[PDB]
UniProtKB/Swiss-Prot annotation, chains A, B:
<feature type="binding site">
    <location>
        <position position="83"/>
    </location>
    <ligand>
        <name>Zn(2+)</name>
    </ligand>
</feature>
<dbReference type="GO" id="GO:0043065">
    <property type="term" value="P:positive regulation of apoptotic process"/>
</dbReference>
<dbReference type="GO" id="GO:0051087">
    <property type="term" value="F:protein-folding chaperone binding"/>
</dbReference>
<dbReference type="GO" id="GO:0035865">
    <property type="term" value="P:cellular response to potassium ion"/>
</dbReference>
<dbReference type="Pfam" id="PF00080">
    <property type="entry name" value="Sod_Cu"/>
</dbReference>
<dbReference type="GO" id="GO:0005737">
    <property type="term" value="C:cytoplasm"/>
</dbReference>
<dbReference type="GO" id="GO:0001895">
    <property type="term" value="P:retina homeostasis"/>
</dbReference>
<dbReference type="GO" id="GO:0051881">
    <property type="term" value="P:regulation of mitochondrial membrane potential"/>
</dbReference>
<dbReference type="GO" id="GO:0006915">
    <property type="term" value="P:apoptotic process"/>
</dbReference>
<dbReference type="GO" id="GO:1904115">
    <property type="term" value="C:axon cytoplasm"/>
</dbReference>
<dbReference type="GO" id="GO:0031667">
    <property type="term" value="P:response to nutrient levels"/>
</dbReference>
<dbReference type="GO" id="GO:0009408">
    <property type="term" value="P:response to heat"/>
</dbReference>
<feature type="modified residue" description="N6-succinyllysine">
    <location>
        <position position="3"/>
    </location>
</feature>
<dbReference type="GO" id="GO:0005758">
    <property type="term" value="C:mitochondrial intermembrane space"/>
</dbReference>
<feature type="modified residue" description="N-acetylalanine">
    <location>
        <position position="1"/>
    </location>
</feature>
<comment type="similarity">
    <text>Belongs to the Cu-Zn superoxide dismutase family.</text>
</comment>
<dbReference type="GO" id="GO:0007605">
    <property type="term" value="P:sensory perception of sound"/>
</dbReference>
Length: 153, 153
C-alpha cells in the first residue's frame, strides 16, 4: 500500500511532481498531478519497466509489458500494461494531468513502484499510426523527463 | 530473479550508483556501489521509508522501519531496518561498497522498492550510544544525496 509518487526531470528544461492515489484491492489507479516547462500539444505519458535512472532516460526500458503486447491508447485492450496516455501541455505548459486507469496498479501484478514514468517529446500516435514504430512506442520521439515511481505519503 | 538500482543523486558534489542483488525467496541481500566525492573514512548508509523525493532527500522520512525498533546498528538485534550502518570513503571519497544483510529483503511481504536510500553527511554511531537522538537517526547529520530503489537490470 499507498500513494505513490514520481517527480519527473532530465536534460529536458521540463519537469513535474506527478501523483498516484489508489484504494480498493486492484483496479483504479487515480493519477493526477502537474508538469511544467513544455511545448504545447500532446505528449506521450508512459511507464518504462526498468527503474534504472542510471544513465538518463535511456535505461527506463521500452513500455511495461507482462506478456508482450503491442501498443494502444488507454481506451483499448490492444495496449501494453505500461502505456497510460498522451497528456496535454496547453500554453505555458501547465500540462495538468488527470487520469483514472484500471490496468496499471499499485500493489501486485501491474506493479509500477520502482518503475519509470516518462513524459515524451513527440505527440502520441496511439497505435492507430500504421507503421511498426508506433506498435513499438506509439511514435512519441524523445523521453524528455523522467523519474522513478517511488513512495510518498 | 529480482534486481534493483539506485543512482544516489544529491545536490552537493556527491553522485552515486548502488545496487541490490538477492534471490531464492529468503537469500540475503546485497549492495555493491560507488558513492562519490564523500568526506573521508565513515559515512551513514541508510534506507528511509517514503520514497517521496519531492523535496529531494528530506521527504524520505525515518529509516525503513516497519517494527518500531530504535536505531539500528549494521548488526544489532535492535536495528531500524533502514540503517545498514556505515561506509568507508577511501581517501578521496570514493566508496566502493558491499553489504549482505538479512533484513533488507525485497519481495514476500516487507519489500523496499519505492523507497529512498540516503547516504549521511557524518559518522553514524550505531544508536546504542544511548541518547533519544543517536537512536533517532544514529547521530548522522544531513542527508547529502538520495535515490529510489526500483526494479533494475
Ligand atoms: Cu513511452
Ligand atoms: Cu538516515
Ligand atoms: Zn506503448
Ligand atoms: Zn536508523
Amino acid at each position: 500500500a499507498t500513494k505513490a509518487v514520481c517527480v519527473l526531470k532530465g536534460d529536458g528544461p521540463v519537469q513535474g511532481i506527478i501523483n498516484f492515489e489508489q484504494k480498493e484491492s486492484n483496479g483504479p489507479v487515480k493519477v493526477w498531478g502537474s508538469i511544467k516547462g513544455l511545448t504545447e500539444g500532446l505528449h506521450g505519458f508512459h511507464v518504462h519497466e526498468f527503474g534504472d535512472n542510471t544513465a538518463g532516460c535511456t535505461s527506463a526500458g521500452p513500455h511495461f509489458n507482462p506478456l508482450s503486447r503491442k501498443h494502444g491508447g488507454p481506451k483499448d485492450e490492444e495496449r501494453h500494461v505500461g502505456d497510460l496516455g498522451n497528456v496535454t501541455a496547453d500554453k505555458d505548459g501547465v500540462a495538468d494531468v488527470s487520469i483514472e486507469d484500471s490496468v496499471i496498479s499499485l500493489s501486485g501484478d501491474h506493479c509500477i513502484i520502482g518503475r519509470t514514468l516518462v513524459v515524451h517529446e513527440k505527440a502520441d500516435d496511439l497505435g492507430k499510426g500504421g507503421n511498426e514504430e508506433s506498435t513499438k512506442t506509439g511514435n512519441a520521439g524523445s523521453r524528455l523527463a523522467c523519474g522513478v515511481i517511488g513512495i510518498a505519503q
